[PDB]
């Protein structure tokens, strides 16, 4: 019941600042995510689907963002990289699920969608589940930066630029990550 708004949102958030949308104490139906024919990568860890019916409506979380096609398999536990240790890191003992689907003609502009951003440069690779907003210039060891965009030291974000002329691995995949817990 309460996640018909999480999977149907008109616009998703970017990866560098994603939403931690929390569902609450209603009767949850996990037979509308299971038995969905529309999904492509349904990946649920140690708490199995169709066995979490009689469990865990204990402020379940539901993250949501959008990454490119062959990026969606950087989201498993472990799996270090660039959009999994700067942007969205989930722990090595991850419990619940990760659901992601192919937005072919819902997020791709023929000129290029240039407002889906992912972080590029960040010291001290990111802790689990921690969200950033702050955009500061990087300071990679050189002369002390103060808003410069010069040699070797520049902006930390970078747009995606989706197009319908891409292959499979570049057209955007919206990712919804579920996670369960107890008291």
């Amino acid at each position, epitope marked *: 019941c309460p996640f018909g708004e999480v999977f149907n949102a008109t616009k998703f958030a970017s990866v560098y600042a994603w939403n931690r949308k929390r569902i609450s104490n209603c009767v949850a139906d996990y037979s509308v995510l299971y038995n969905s024919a529309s999904f492509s990568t*349904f990946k649920c860890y140690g708490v199995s689907p*169709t066995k979490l019916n009689d469990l865990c409506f204990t402020n379940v979380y539901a993250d949501s963002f959008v990454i490119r096609g062959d990026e969606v398999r950087q989201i*498993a536990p472990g799996q270090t990289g660039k959009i999994a240790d700067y942007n969205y890191k989930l722990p090595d*003992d991850f419990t619940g699920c990760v659901i992601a689907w192919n937005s072919n003609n819902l997020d791709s502009k023929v000129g290029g969608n240039y407002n889906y951003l992912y972080r590029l440069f960040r010291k001290s690779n990111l802790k689990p589940f921690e969200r950033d907003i702050s955009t500061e210039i990087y300071q990679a060891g050189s002369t002390p930066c103060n808003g410069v965009k010069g040699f070797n030291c520049y902006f930390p974000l970078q747009s995606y630029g989706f197009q319908p002329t891409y292959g499979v*691995g570049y057209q955007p995949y919206r990712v919804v990550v579920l996670s369960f817990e107890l008291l």
Partner: antibody, heavy 131, light 109 residues
Framework: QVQLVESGGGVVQPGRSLRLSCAAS????????MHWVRQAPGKGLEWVAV????????YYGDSVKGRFTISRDNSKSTLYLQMNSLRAEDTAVYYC????????????????????????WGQGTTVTVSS | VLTQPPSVSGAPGQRVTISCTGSSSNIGAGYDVHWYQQLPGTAPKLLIY???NRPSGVPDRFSGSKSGTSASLAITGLQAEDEADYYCQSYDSSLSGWVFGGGTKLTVL
């Protein structure tokens, strides 16, 4: 830090066998599915065996099927590869490589017919079958 | 297996492609191909997984692709360090094995 140290080096007869010991420390060993992958000297790598986080799902390579076996012990957190009828073409150096934690398929069917790669690799202990 | 060119070479600072051709029962069926850089004398290190992704430690030069039945570890601006072997690894469904490639031989000039 993580590593995959290993032991069980071999100078043995064509038809007899030995049992490897691929140890592990540092990472969560009880959740992820190790692989065994060999390299005969002169050529490139070749995949040998796989086993899951418990010991249920196991596949093999076509040169090594039915003869070899692979087992896990979560009391000493190691791997073993037993190689009965070690005939002549089965010589290599044997690497044990960490797989992934994967389990999926929304019908309850826990399985791994997977896509991912082998992240951290062993040191390799050379086995030698010689007439 | 997955066929691979036995020997390709290139001067420092160029862009050298490394092909990896497969059938329809493997990489062409929808399974991804990875890339390992095995220096002669050690264990192969994971370079690309899932056709585009680079872990922490591998630099920004190693770009991979996958289209049709192929792959390309495009090394751009190669230095005097990366002259090792490169193996592409799919997982086929005809024999359910995690099949590797024959192995290329890249040396700088």
């Amino acid at each position: 830090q993580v590593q995959l140290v290993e032991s069980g080096g071999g100078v043995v007869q064509p038809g007899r066998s030995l049992r490897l010991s691929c140890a592990a420390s540092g990472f969560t060993f009880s959740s992820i599915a190790m692989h065994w992958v060999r390299q005969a000297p002169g050529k490139g790598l070749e995949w040998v065996a796989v086993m899951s986080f418990d010991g249920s799902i196991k596949y093999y390579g076509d040169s090594v099927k039915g003869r070899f076996t692979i087992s896990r012990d979560n009391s000493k957190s190691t791997l073993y590869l037993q190689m009965n009828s070690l005939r002549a073409e089965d010589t290599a150096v044997y690497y044990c490589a960490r797989g992934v934690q994967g389990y999926y398929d929304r019908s309850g069917y826990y399985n791994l017919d997977y896509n991912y790669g082998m992240d951290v690799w062993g040191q390799g202990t050379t086995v030698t079958v010689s007439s | 297996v997955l066929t691979q060119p036995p020997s390709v070479s290139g001067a420092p600072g160029q862009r050298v492609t490394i092909s990896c051709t497969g059938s329809s029962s493997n990489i062409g069926a929808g399974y991804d191909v990875h890339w390992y850089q095995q220096l002669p004398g050690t264990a192969p290190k994971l370079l690309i997984y899932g056709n585009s992704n680079r872990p922490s430690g591998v630099p920004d030069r190693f770009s991979g692709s996958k289209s049709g039945t192929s792959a390309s570890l495009a090394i751009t601006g190669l230095q005097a360090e990366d002259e090792a072997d490169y193996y592409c690894q799919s997982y086929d469904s005809s024999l359910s094995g995690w099949v590797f490639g024959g192995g290329t031989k890249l040396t700088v000039l």
